Design a protein around this motif. Structure first.
Motif, PDB file in Angstrom:
ATOM      1  N   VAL A  86       0.851  -1.180   0.000  1.00  0.00           N
ATOM      2  CA  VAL A  86       0.000   0.000   0.000  1.00  0.00           C
ATOM      3  C   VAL A  86       0.890   1.234   0.000  1.00  0.00           C
ATOM      4  N   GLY A  87       0.772   1.999  -1.076  1.00  0.00           N
ATOM      5  CA  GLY A  87       1.638   3.155  -1.269  1.00  0.00           C
ATOM      6  C   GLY A  87       0.859   4.424  -1.069  1.00  0.00           C
ATOM      7  N   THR A  88       1.394   5.512  -1.610  1.00  0.00           N
ATOM      8  CA  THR A  88       0.813   6.803  -1.397  1.00  0.00           C
ATOM      9  C   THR A  88      -0.523   6.940  -2.134  1.00  0.00           C
ATOM     10  N   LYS A  89      -0.645   6.367  -3.325  1.00  0.00           N
ATOM     11  CA  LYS A  89      -1.830   6.696  -4.154  1.00  0.00           C
ATOM     12  C   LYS A  89      -3.018   5.884  -3.706  1.00  0.00           C
ATOM     13  N   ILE A  90      -2.758   4.708  -3.162  1.00  0.00           N
ATOM     14  CA  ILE A  90      -3.850   3.892  -2.614  1.00  0.00           C
ATOM     15  C   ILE A  90      -4.282   4.458  -1.252  1.00  0.00           C
ATOM     16  N   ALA A  91      -3.326   4.776  -0.383  1.00  0.00           N
ATOM     17  CA  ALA A  91      -3.599   5.580   0.809  1.00  0.00           C
ATOM     18  C   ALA A  91      -4.610   6.681   0.523  1.00  0.00           C
ATOM     19  N   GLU A  92      -4.363   7.479  -0.521  1.00  0.00           N
ATOM     20  CA  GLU A  92      -5.258   8.570  -0.954  1.00  0.00           C
ATOM     21  C   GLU A  92      -6.655   8.152  -1.408  1.00  0.00           C
ATOM     22  N   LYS A  93      -6.704   7.083  -2.197  1.00  0.00           N
ATOM     23  CA  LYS A  93      -7.985   6.533  -2.608  1.00  0.00           C
ATOM     24  C   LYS A  93      -8.727   5.962  -1.366  1.00  0.00           C
ATOM     25  N   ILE A  94      -7.994   5.366  -0.427  1.00  0.00           N
ATOM     26  CA  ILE A  94      -8.686   4.927   0.799  1.00  0.00           C
ATOM     27  C   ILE A  94      -9.327   6.131   1.503  1.00  0.00           C
ATOM     28  N   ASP A  95      -8.574   7.208   1.684  1.00  0.00           N
ATOM     29  CA  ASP A  95      -9.161   8.415   2.268  1.00  0.00           C
ATOM     30  C   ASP A  95     -10.386   8.889   1.568  1.00  0.00           C
ATOM     31  N   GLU A  96     -10.360   8.919   0.233  1.00  0.00           N
ATOM     32  CA  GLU A  96     -11.535   9.349  -0.497  1.00  0.00           C
ATOM     33  C   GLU A  96     -12.688   8.381  -0.292  1.00  0.00           C
ATOM     34  N   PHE A  97     -12.395   7.079  -0.356  1.00  0.00           N
ATOM     35  CA  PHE A  97     -13.458   6.122  -0.148  1.00  0.00           C
ATOM     36  C   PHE A  97     -14.048   6.240   1.273  1.00  0.00           C
ATOM     37  N   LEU A  98     -13.187   6.441   2.281  1.00  0.00           N
ATOM     38  CA  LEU A  98     -13.693   6.595   3.628  1.00  0.00           C
ATOM     39  C   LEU A  98     -14.597   7.817   3.793  1.00  0.00           C
ATOM     40  N   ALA A  99     -14.311   8.907   3.100  1.00  0.00           N
ATOM     41  CA  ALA A  99     -15.058  10.144   3.343  1.00  0.00           C
ATOM     42  C   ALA A  99     -16.336  10.219   2.509  1.00  0.00           C
ATOM     43  N   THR A 100     -16.350   9.534   1.381  1.00  0.00           N
ATOM     44  CA  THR A 100     -17.459   9.692   0.479  1.00  0.00           C
ATOM     45  C   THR A 100     -18.162   8.385   0.249  1.00  0.00           C
ATOM     46  N   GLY A 101     -17.569   7.268   0.682  1.00  0.00           N
ATOM     47  CA  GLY A 101     -18.099   5.944   0.328  1.00  0.00           C
ATOM     48  C   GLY A 101     -17.949   5.615  -1.161  1.00  0.00           C
ATOM     49  N   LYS A 102     -17.119   6.362  -1.881  1.00  0.00           N
ATOM     50  CA  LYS A 102     -16.864   6.053  -3.300  1.00  0.00           C
ATOM     51  C   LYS A 102     -15.506   6.606  -3.782  1.00  0.00           C
ATOM     52  N   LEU A 103     -15.208   6.353  -5.060  1.00  0.00           N
ATOM     53  CA  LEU A 103     -14.157   7.047  -5.808  1.00  0.00           C
ATOM     54  C   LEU A 103     -14.686   7.629  -7.096  1.00  0.00           C
TER      55      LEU A 103
END
Ligand SMILES: [Mg+2]
Ligand SMILES: [Mg+2]
Ligand code: NA
Ligand code: NA
Length: 326
Positions: A59-76
DNA sequence: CCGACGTCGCATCAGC
DNA sequence: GCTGATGCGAC
DNA sequence: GTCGG
């Protein structure tokens, strides 16, 4: 761990793996997404943030970021948009036909062919494998319960022994690890007359299995590997069994047990077994175990007479197939 | 900054 | 015709 | 995309 812990994340990641593979044609990103989906699936805590995910190997930086987005919005957003994209979701879908990969899927979608309906109206544009894939689309995605596997194994061993009682056959796969169901059947074959320091041995078997109507179609056949379809015979007034993928390989005697180990898997377990193998001065592929040299010099294949022998060289208690999930 | 990320049998394509 | 490269599926 | 030489 229960799929509802990080389920939404791992499905997001695997969906992104799929697009890389099938649409972007970026196999290394596909495998990076799957590697990160795996380590997440195994993680025994509800992920609360990307930085938390980031700790996991893969798990790198860009997946870390997509996880944050998924956590806050429930999507990407990027995933939302790719889904409603006609060209890209068609290309992605058609790859579910056995024999249509990223590249044939692209070609079809370019020229208007997007759905199985379209594939049906255009038989002449599909190769042999692709027709068989199309014909069994539904069947091929189903799973095989153990009970039908044991029944399939009965046919195989019976017919192989009938062709020539000196053949040795082992059904490998997750079947062999005792799984409750399987996605296909993988038969490994050898014969005392066949070593590597040395083309009908394979064909004869395939032939017997078509003769008793067990093998119904052929995807590919050569001197050492057969890929095909089979189907159990139907019960007396019952609905017919689905068509199944079956592979049958012919391996020389002195490579048989490496082959059995390799196609017994799982890949996860083989990754481990390979790593430990390296750790003790040895390399193991599907064909052989070789000692590594004073410099990295993999040398002669060593004598192997059973699965155990291999485990012996690298100093591991032989692991029962039922324990080879990891 | 940048290369590795498994390897291989067969069907079929590209090019001579 | 043949050889080599590419696509595919697959622990 | 991620890891590591
Ligand atoms: Mg006999
Ligand atoms: Mg298998
Ligand atoms: Na990490
Ligand atoms: Na496919």
């Amino acid at each position: 761990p229960q799929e509802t812990l990080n389920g939404g994340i791992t499905d997001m990641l695997t969906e992104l793996a799929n697009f890389e593979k099938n649409v972007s044609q970026a196999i290394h990103k596909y495998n990076a997404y799957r590697k990160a989906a795996s380590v997440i699936a195994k993680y025994p805590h509800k992920i609360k943030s990307g930085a938390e995910a980031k700790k996991l190997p893969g798990v790198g930086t860009k997946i870390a970021e997509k996880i944050d987005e998924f956590l806050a919005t429930g999507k990407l957003r990027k995933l939302e948009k790719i889904r409603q994209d006609d060209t890209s979701s068609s290309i992605n879908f058609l790859t579910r036909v056995s024999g249509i990969g990223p590249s044939a899927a692209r070609k079809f979608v370019d020229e208007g062919i997007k759905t199985l309906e379209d594939l049906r109206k255009n038989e002449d544009k599909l190769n042999h494998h692709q027709r068989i894939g199309l014909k069994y689309f539904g069947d091929f995605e189903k799973r095989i319960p153990r009970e039908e596997m044991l029944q399939m194994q009965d046919i195989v061993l019976n017919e192989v022994k009938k062709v020539d009682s000196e053949y040795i056959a082992t059904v490998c796969g997750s079947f062999r690890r005792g799984a409750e169901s399987s996605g296909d059947m993988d038969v490994l074959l050898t014969h005392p007359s066949f070593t590597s320091e040395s083309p009908k041995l394979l064909h004869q078997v395939v032939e017997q299995l078509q003769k008793v109507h067990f093998i119904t179609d052929t995807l590919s056949k050569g001197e050492t590997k057969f890929m095909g379809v089979c189907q159990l015979p139907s019960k007396n007034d019952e609905k017919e069994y689905p068509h199944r993928r079956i592979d049958i390989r012919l391996i020389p005697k002195d490579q048989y047990y490496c082959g059995v180990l390799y196609f017994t898997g799982s890949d996860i377990f083989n990754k481990n077994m390979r790593a430990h193998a390296l750790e003790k001065g040895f390399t193991i592929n599907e064909y052989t175990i070789r000692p590594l040299g004073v410099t990295g010099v993999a040398g002669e294949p060593l004598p192997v007479d059973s699965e155990k022998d291999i485990f012996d060289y690298i100093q591991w208690k032989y692991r029962e197939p039922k324990d080879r999930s990891e």
